[PDB]
Design a protein around this nucleic acid. Structure first.
Lengths: 249, 705, 511
RNA sequence: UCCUUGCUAC
RNA sequence: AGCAUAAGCAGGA
């Protein structure tokens, strides 16, 4: 029943007079130069405006109908959490954020959270299970390399990944049929057994796919072995005047 | 007792006590007021460095044209810098260059370059720094200036169907052939402009004052080009980028430390029984007033002699656009009475009529520039200002370093934008004077002026190159900027992990020893806590956010699972600068706390780390009160249209949406496509399909009318 | 594919912009494709070598590294916004509920009794006495009624600049008059001053340990594994535990609290003149106290651009006799008497009008970052030591190592004061902090040129026989940027004294 | 011709 | 007055 809503929105936006001169006058690729129209120059002092923003009493834009479902207009001694000034969006204080975090409703979603971030929990799981040793205090240093830095098991090269996510999530406008599909097409079947029914949005899904398939190869000063497991252990393992390595397993 | 902080250098090196001599803990000096005098000094100083008076009249422009190559009036002051290039000498240096490595060298690099130009989309022009919009004559980011250009194209004659680089360049040249060009002024009126005025406006470069340059006493004017110059400069920078990546005597792309060890070792393995080596640290002076684009035109005509017929004419347009640039002269000056009470403002237009209200220096600099001034601009035709060709001048330097005269005394080195390192090999000291004066001779003929004030030499490796002072064995690191550790300023969630990312990348690339790492981590933690007003629970701070935390701390069981944004302590360290704080702490949180924080039904986030403190601060207040109000409304329209595109193609922010038909037809054809696919295996209802078909046909008849 | 759009004005433009021995781009393109070089190249080169007249300058035979030219003129004044060496603070125990800066201001009106803070209307020296007397009485009765907002009087309208702006008239109406309002422009530059004599005593004052202890608000130490984290935690604890007690940290806390409070007042209330105290916080005998150094007054800052230079009027507290050479920009009044137990000494109230901006508010209020390069320098020394020896010698190497500083005044030659390595951190934080204060154009250009001279001294240390091409223009570029900054003149003089001490061993210098 | 007002926690 | 340094800020709509 989404196509009726899309027809109502498309007829609603072709109802406007001077908006009809916008679409069907450009091209598809102009979407990119339609996405960026930041008339501010550079936001050249972000932390300055962030401290000036947090210096006020109501700096935040927050939703009304979710916060009036559970929240409270003022806390127990003069702490303001609400305004009536202005779309229906209400200004608020970070005291309402911490009041939400300590006296608000709660929904169990730990499976979704521990499944979106599998690469990062894999990093912490590999970090907890390592053992170190003594230092060395020796001269060390070597040239700059292009090294894959993530312990993935697939190792694609940023060209099968975009085409892979075209031919898994939404195949109606994916690509011309190339030669890179066939064998990995079997994996596509397995992916269509995974991302079929989830509450995860397609931008979050296309985010979390590219972190189990993409070994991030960068141009870094390396020394010793070039195993891909010890590349966060590159900045952890040694610098210019010192070195620490006693990893057994 | 006196005190002296330099005495540490009596028993140390300049690789340890050299970070002490940078005043990088204080503010950079900013500029104030008009930037007219600095632009006048740049243009008039270039014409003073022309070393000629050979002027040639013009048929296109209404102003005289001074020539800058092969036309020399040799002054006796030759230690003064010249800006006059001999083209037979430099083509002899390029022919001397390609006889060193390979035979079809330039053919190979040019075929790779054109091979990368033909597979390039023009939206790459939006991934850049600020440019100059000639529609409203201001400085804007790249995407706004590009869409205002395409807006002027589609409003003037026809529509646009290009979607490549080459067809966009051809579209600009076709816009040069048009007799009249029309655009939108401000409340959106539609104006027109002529043909010679469009040429005068397509070649306008906007000059301003360079703000925040650590290391100079006087200010300097930086210049920004338009939009009709950026694709051609992109082409030339791809060509020279491939040439510089292929060479072995350059330091722009980057390793810059392996090359110097290989050339110091490889040229210290090439000595006879009596020879020796002298290295000389140099600095090329007036680098932006002595690089003419006419020698660039001849050299780029020499590289692509056997490449194609497209590339031979496509790599020969940006030099022709640099031989005829205009310059915006800032915004004028200000006059005042004797009592300093009323101060009138004179802009750059009426500066000629108000000529007799200036100083001595302003009238000197203005009367050396008067027959080259237009109404607003000036006609410079031999300068190469800042923010332009940077990888081709390095090819000029490598051409000066590969000179072969035929003893057995010679030189090598390494070249950057304007900083060279010269290694000389000879036998006695007057022969060293002969070789070094030969180097200043070849650089002096080609158009490169070594500065005699900032240059010196030694026998072994004690040189200096791109602010890394190399001593005999050790190397010091670059003194990095301090405010870069805290420049996120968006969120309570995307600040501390971004600061750990900046500390990490400054630990890998530069030195950044572990003590400086822990200290910088702790100071960024403290500026975070001072910014967002959150202190730990055991602290004595009693404000409007710690009253709630101090009141409700008895509910939380495991107290060291709290976030730093909620009054938690620190668990990240040097060995955890890739693990965020939230993901490190989710093994220790209370289930009530964790289920309450990460709830996606939150009134703040709804409408790389975990998104649960992600809020948006409110907008400004004077953005809807000026004369530029409705332009803000204009961006709203674009957002709405983009949202409609996101409503149709469910995966559009992943892959780049190329195509050249329209945006509305792909929407309607897509809704009919998924209406048929979801029709025959799905929907099946006459009122829904006929009502959707009725809305698509009614919206199509509304769009066509 | 291979067709470029051959337009007309572009080919008539490319044919106009070729070099001079060519007619069209076609003739140039046909000549560049058939080019073979010759040996007139070397003849043109040597004909360029002959008309040169350029000789290189050795140092072992013409050691003309003369000392720099310090100006011999009027002494450079005290230019920092606050008072460092001559400060006087009133203390009270810190109340956590009364922690906003205006409440600190009120509780110090009852604590530090301003009822005894009578001033005579005749100052000792200075410029404007009655305006400062009426402004001090007006702001003191403003603090007495417990509200910080100056009602409009003649004194505040004269001091913080209100209505003192030129009329910016655009060039649409000018209404020119015959020989009336003759207008033009003129610029002058900056005036030149001399070597400061008060600067050494404030260098040695600032690194002397102050009994009030911890000043800088640092943060907590993260837990450590069995890694190199013991090294980082140890260096941070030792270096931080040395630098927290000094008198430089008192001024860093003074800039953070005072200028940070001025920063939030400049955001929240433009167009209204506020009253901001000048205070710190430090632990006295474990009891957390907050101090009070003076009373600062804002000047209706409508900060439009990154500049703005709003006018801060500072009333300061001192207990020393003033000096018309050092305290030249002040307007020194008096205060009264203070009991100071080891008897009851005098108290001088000082006055000064000054100015700030948005950018220096952002850079002074974050001066804690001056701890970041300091440790770096220290750690480099330590690391290179073990890099030469390949053994964990860190703890005893911060104890059995000396570091030269501070030669005496009557003699300099090989009479140097070596300290321990760890105490070295004190000296380094002071100079980093001075780079935060006295940053100008002059200090930047001076720091480039001193890096050149340091390269010359390193070439002298190892006997590499360096050489220069043009010494005269070199000193004519260094001496341009030593005008009136106190740090620049002080560091140029100490650079000359490094040349005097180093002249006793290596031979490239003068006396 | 006219002078609106934002509420500060190291 | 002052900040500041080769020219600005010290209100404006």
């Amino acid at each position: 029943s989404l196509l009726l809503t899309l027809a109502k929105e498309y007829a609603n936006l072709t109802k406007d007079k001077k908006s009809c001169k916008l679409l069907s006058q450009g091209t598809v690729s102009s979407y990119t130069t339609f996405k960026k129209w930041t008339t501010s120059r550079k936001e050249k002092n972000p932390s300055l405006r962030m401290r000036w923003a947090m210096g006020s009493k109501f700096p935040i834009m927050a939703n009304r109908e979710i916060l009036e479902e559970a929240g409270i207009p003022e806390q127990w001694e003069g702490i303001d959490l609400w305004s009536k000034k202005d779309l229906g969006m209400v200004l608020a204080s970070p005291a309402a954020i911490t009041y939400w975090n300590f006296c608000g409703p709660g929904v169990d979603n730990s499976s979704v959270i521990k499944d979106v971030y599998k690469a990062k929990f894999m990093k912490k799981e590999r970090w907890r299970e390592t053992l170190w040793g003594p230092m060395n205090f020796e001269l060390v240093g070597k040239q700059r390399r292009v090294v894959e830095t993530q312990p993935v098991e697939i190792k694609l090269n940023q060209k099968e990944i975009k085409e892979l996510t075209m031919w898994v999530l939404f195949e109606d406008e994916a690509n011309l049929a190339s030669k890179f599909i066939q064998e990995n097409f079997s994996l596509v079947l397995s992916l269509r057994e995974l991302y079929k029914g989830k509450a995860v949005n397609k931008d979050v899904a296309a985010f979390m796919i590219a972190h189990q398939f993409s070994p991030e190869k960068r141009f870094l000063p390396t020394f010793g072995p070039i195993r891909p497991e010890r590349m966060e252990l590159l900045h952890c393992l040694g610098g210019d005047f010192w070195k620490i390595e006693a990893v057994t397993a | 007792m006196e005190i002296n902080p330099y005495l540490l250098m009596l028993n140390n090196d300049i690789t340890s006590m050299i970070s002490l001599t940078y005043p990088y803990t204080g503010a950079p000096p900013m500029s104030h007021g008009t930037s007219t005098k600095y632009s006048m000094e740049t243009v008039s100083r270039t014409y003073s460095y022309s070393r000629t008076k050979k002027e040639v009249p013009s048929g296109i422009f209404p102003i005289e044209r001074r020539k800058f190559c092969n036309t020399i009036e040799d002054k006796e002051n030759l230690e003064k810098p010249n800006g006059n290039v001999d083209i037979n000498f430099m083509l002899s240096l390029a022919e001397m260059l390609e006889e060193k490595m390979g035979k079809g060298f330039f053919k190979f690099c040019a075929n790779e370059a054109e091979a990368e130009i033909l597979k390039m989309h023009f939206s790459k022009l939006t991934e850049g720094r600020q440019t100059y919009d000639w529609t409203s004559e201001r400085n804007m980011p790249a995407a706004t200036a590009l869409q205002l250009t395409v807006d002027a194209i589609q409003e003037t004659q026809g529509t646009f169907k290009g979607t490549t680089m080459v067809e966009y360049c051809n579209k600009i040249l076709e816009m040069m052939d048009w007799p009249e060009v029309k655009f939108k002024k401000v409340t959106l009126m539609i104006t027109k402009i002529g043909r010679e005025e469009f040429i005068k406006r397509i070649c306008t470069i906007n000059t301003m004052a360079k703000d925040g340059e650590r290391g100079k006493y006087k200010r300097r004017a930086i210049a920004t080009p338009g939009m009709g110059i950026r694709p051609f400069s992109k082409i030339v920078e791809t060509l020279a980028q491939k040439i510089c990546e292929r060479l072995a005597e350059s330091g722009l792309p980057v390793e810059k430390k392996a090359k110097l060890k290989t050339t110091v070792s490889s040229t210290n393995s090439k000595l006879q029984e009596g020879q020796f080596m002298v290295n000389i640290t140099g600095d090329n002076s007036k680098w932006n007033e002595c690089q003419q684009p006419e020698a660039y035109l001849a050299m780029l005509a020499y590289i692509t002699k056997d490449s194609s017929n497209l590339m031979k004419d496509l790599c020969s347009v940006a030099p022709t656009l640099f031989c005829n640039k205009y310059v915006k002269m800032g915004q004028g000056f200000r006059a005042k009475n004797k009592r300093k009470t009323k101060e009138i403002v004179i802009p750059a237009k009426k500066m000629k009529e108000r000529k007799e209200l200036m100083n001595a220096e302003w009238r000197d600099l203005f009367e050396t520039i008067e027959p080259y001034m237009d109404g607003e601009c000036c006609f410079l035709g031999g300068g190469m200002l800042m923010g332009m060709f940077n990888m081709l001048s390095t090819v000029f330097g490598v051409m000066t370093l590969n000179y072969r005269e035929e003893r057995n005394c010679y030189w090598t080195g390494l070249q950057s934008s304007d900083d060279f390192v010269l290694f000389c090999i000879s036998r006695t000291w007057p022969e060293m004077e002969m070789t070094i004066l030969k180097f200043i001779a070849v650089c002096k003929l080609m158009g490169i002026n070594m500065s005699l004030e900032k240059s010196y030499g030694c026998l072994p490796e004690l040189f200096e190159f791109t602010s890394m002072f190399f001593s005999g064995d050790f190397v010091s690191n670059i003194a990095l900027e301090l405010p870069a550790f805290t420049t996120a300023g968006m969120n309570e969630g995307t600040d501390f992990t971004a600061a750990m990312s900046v500390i990490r990348t400054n630990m890998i690339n530069n030195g950044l020893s572990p003590g400086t790492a822990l200290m910088a981590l702790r100071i960024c933690l403290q500026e975070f806590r001072a910014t967002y007003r959150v202190h730990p629970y055991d602290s004595g701070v009693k404000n409007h956010r710690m009253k709630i935390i101090r009141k409700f701390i008895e509910t939380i069981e495991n107290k060291d699972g709290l976030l730093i944004s909620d009054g938690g302590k620190l668990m990240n360290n040097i060995s955890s600068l890739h693990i965020p704080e939230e993901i490190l702490k989710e093994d220790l949180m209370d289930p009530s706390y964790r289920n309450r924080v990460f709830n996606p039904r939150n009134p703040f986030t709804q409408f790389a780390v975990v998104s649960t403190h992600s809020f948006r601060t409110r907008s400004n207040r004077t953005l809807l009160n000026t004369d530029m109000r409705a332009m803000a409304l204009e961006e709203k329209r674009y957002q709405v249209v983009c949202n409609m595109y996101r409503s149709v193609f469910e995966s559009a922010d992943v892959n780049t949406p190329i195509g050249s038909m329209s945006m509305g037809e792909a929407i309607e054809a897509k809704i009919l496509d998924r209406a048929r696919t979801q029709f025959e295996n799905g929907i099946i209802g006459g009122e829904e399909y006929s009502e959707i078909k009725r809305l698509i046909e009614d919206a199509k008849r509304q769009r066509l009318s | 594919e291979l067709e470029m759009y051959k337009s007309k004005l572009f080919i008539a433009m490319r044919d106009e912009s070729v070099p001079l021995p060519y007619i069209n781009y076609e003739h140039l393109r046909t000549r560049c494709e058939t080019f073979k070089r010759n040996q007139a190249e070397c003849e043109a080169k040597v004909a360029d070598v002959a008309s040169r007249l350029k000789i290189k300058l050795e140092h072992l035979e013409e050691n003309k590294l003369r000392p720099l030219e310090i100006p011999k003129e009027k002494e450079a004044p005290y230019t920092h916004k606050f008072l460092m060496k001559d400060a006087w603070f009133f203390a009270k125990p810190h109340d956590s509920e009364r922690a906003q800066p205006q409440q600190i201001l009120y509780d110090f009106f009852e604590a530090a009794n301003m009822g005894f803070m009578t001033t005579s209307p005749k100052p000792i020296f200075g410029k404007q006495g009655l305006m400062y007397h009426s402004l001090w009485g007006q702001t003191k009765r403003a603090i007495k009624d417990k509200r910080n907002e100056l009602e409009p009087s003649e004194q505040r309208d004269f001091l913080c600049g209100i209505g003192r702006a030129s009329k910016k008239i655009q060039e649409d109406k000018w209404q020119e008059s015959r020989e009336e309002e003759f207008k033009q422009e003129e610029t002058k530059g900056a005036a030149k001053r001399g070597f400061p004599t008060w600067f050494n005593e404030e260098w040695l004052w600032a690194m002397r340990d102050s009994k009030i202890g911890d000043w800088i608000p640092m943060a907590e130490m993260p837990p450590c594994k069995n890694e190199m984290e013991d090294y980082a935690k140890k260096m941070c604890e030792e270096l931080e535990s040395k630098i927290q007690g000094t008198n430089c940290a008192r001024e860093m806390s003074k800039l953070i609290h005072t200028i940070g409070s001025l920063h939030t007042e400049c955001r929240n209330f433009p167009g209204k003149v506020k009253i901001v105290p000048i205070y710190c916080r430090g632990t006295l005998r474990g009891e957390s106290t907050d101090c009070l150094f003076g009373i600062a007054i804002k000047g209706k800052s409508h900060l439009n651009k990154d500049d703005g230079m709003y006018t801060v009027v500072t009333f300061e507290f001192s207990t020393e006799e003033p000096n018309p050479s050092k305290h030249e920009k002040y307007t020194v009044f008096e205060a009264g008497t203070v009991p100071v137990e080891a008897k009851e000494k005098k108290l001088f109230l000082y006055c000064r009008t000054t100015g700030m901006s948005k950018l220096k508010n952002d850079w002074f209020s974050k001066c804690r970052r001056c701890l970041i390069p300091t440790m770096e320098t220290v750690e480099q020394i330590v690391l290179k030591e073990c890099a030469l020896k390949e053994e964990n010698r860190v703890s005893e190497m911060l104890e059995n190592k000396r570091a030269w500083i501070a030669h005496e005044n009557g003699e300099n030659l090989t009479r140097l004061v070596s300290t321990k390595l760890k105490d070295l951190c004190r000296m380094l934080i002071v100079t980093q902090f001075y780079y935060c204060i006295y940053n100008d154009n002059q200090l930047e250009g001076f720091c480039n040129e001193q890096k050149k001279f340091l390269m010359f001294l390193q070439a002298d240390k190892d006997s590499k026989s360096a050489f220069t091409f043009n010494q005269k223009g070199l000193y004519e570029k260094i001496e341009e940027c030593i005008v009136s900054n106190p740090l620049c003149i002080f560091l140029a003089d100490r650079l000359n004294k490094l040349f005097l001490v180093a002249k006793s061993n290596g031979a490239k210098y003068f006396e």
